[PDB]
Structure formats: C-alpha cells, structure tokens
Design a binder for this molecule. Structure first.
Ligand code: 98E
Length: 230
C-alpha cells in the first residue's frame, strides 16, 4: 500500500527510461540548435506554401508525435492491465495533452521560436494555416511551461501523470487508475525532493488549462482532417 524507497526509486527509473526510449530528438540537440533560425527567404517560402501543404507538414509531425506518446503510455507500469475502456479513455484525453506538453522542449522563450523542419522559426512561419489565435495559444502555453526549465526526467514524470489521471470522466475502474496515479505522484515528489525542485509543483499549469487547450487544438485538427484527410 505504501511503496518503499526502493520501489519508488525503481518506478522513477522505469518512467525515465521509457520516456527516453520514446522521444524523437534529444533535448540537448534541441537546445544546441537554438541559434539555427530560418532566414527571411525561408520564412516567406513557408508563408507562400498552400494551406494544404502546411497542413500535411504539421499533420505528419503530429502523427509521429502521437505515435511516440502512445508507445510511452503502454510502457508505464500497470497501463496495459487497465481494461480496454479505461485505456481508451486515458489515451483519448491524455495523448494530445502529452503531445502539447512535449512541444515545450522545442520552444525557445528567448525569441518565441519553435523547432520545425530543421530550424527555429516564429509563429509567422505557419501563416498559411490561418490559425494565428490557436498557434499563439500553443506558444503561450509552451512559454509558461518553458519557465520551469524541465529536465527530461521531470518531463517523463510529469507526462506520466498527464496520462495516468483518475479524474478523467468515463473511467470504469477508477481505483486501479488512482493506485497508478498515486504511485507516480510518489515517484515525482521523491525525484523533486531529491533534487530540491519541489517548488516547481506550485508552478505547473492547471490541469483544466491543458485540457482546454487540447480541446481547442483537436477542434481545429478535425476541421483540417475533414477538408484534407491525411
Ligand atoms: C522533431 C521535432 N520535435 C519537436 C517539434 C515541436 O514540438 N515544434 C513545435 C513546438 C511548439 Cl511549442 C509549437 C510548434 C508550432 N506548431 C504549429 C503547427 N501545429 C499545428 O498543430 C497546426 C495544425 C493545424 C492547427 C495548428 C503544431 C505542430 C504546433 C511547433 C512546431 C518539432 N519537430
């Protein structure tokens, strides 16, 4: 019922290994490459692309991102033991939320640029999409998250808890999800206490804010998918 220190340490290690096995680019590489910024020629090139081409570019990126998140979820202890309903409930709510959180790794707060197709560019890069307000919202959320200066280990633990969330409506074995959520909270708090970083807990975004942004994101994605299916 009350996991030992050894159990908690092993869970931290498990989650962090699972995460590193399931992310595309190393954070160190994203950080190093912040100086590589799209030229004006490249930006205007992107802006002159059709809406549909830009949609394809973004949708294929998101497909890859979601695929990695699903693989991460399945590697979390206990997840594959949950009934199918609960797995689906958690993934349908949580996968795109984790995708959004993982985006902050590729966000540069110094100049409000993001990594996309080999270099950093501002929100202007995506003009052809005609989604200025939504993209601004994504940049804003990422800027707030960027302020925590997450380690990869912290992102692993935080995103585990984004997924393993017993407060999702529709769950049929809430106790089982609650148990997994608690164990993961114990892992997160242990790792933060070890590293003297517990203060970051009072700086995480409200879970509702993440859900709302996800809802707004998915709404627009469904529109593009309807107009131009991938
Ligand atoms: C290899 C690799 N790793 C990580 C990353 C990355 O996260 N970049 C990244 C990070 C942040 Cl904070 C914001 C953005 C902006 N874009 C805008 C387009 N977009 C959409 O969904 C549109 C589709 C229709 C609706 C809006 C999203 C992909 C977000 C990006 C690209 C990239 N490449």
């Amino acid at each position: 019922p009350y996991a030992s220190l050894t159990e908690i340490e092993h869970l931290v290690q498990s989650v962090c290994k699972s995460y590193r096995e399931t992310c595309q680019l190393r954070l160190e590489d994203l950080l190093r490459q912040r100086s590589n910024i799209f030229s004006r020629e490249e930006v205007t090139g992107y802006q002159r692309k059709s809406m549909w081409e830009m949609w394809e570019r973004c949708a294929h990126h998101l497909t890859e991102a979601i695929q990695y998140v699903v693989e991460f979820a399945k590697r979390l202890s206990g997840f594959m033991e949950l009934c199918q309903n609960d797995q689906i409930v958690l993934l349908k709510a949580g996968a795109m939320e984790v995708v959004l959180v993982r985006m902050c790794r590729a966000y540069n707060a110094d100049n409000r640029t993001v990594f996309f197709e080999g270099k950093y560019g501002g929100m202007e890069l995506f003009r052809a999409l005609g989604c200025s307000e939504l993209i601004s919202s994504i940049f804003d959320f990422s800027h707030s998250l960027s302020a925590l200066h997450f380690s990869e280990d912290e992102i692993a633990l935080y995103t585990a808890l984004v997924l393993i969330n017993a407060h999702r409506p529709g769950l049929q074995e809430k106790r089982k999800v609650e148990q997994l959520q608690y164990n993961l909270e114990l892992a997160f708090h242990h790792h933060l206490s070890k590293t003297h970083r517990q203060s970051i807990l009072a700086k995480l975004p409200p879970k509702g804010k993440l859900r709302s942004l996800c809802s707004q994101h998915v709404e627009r994605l469904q529109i593009f998918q309807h107009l131009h299916p991938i």
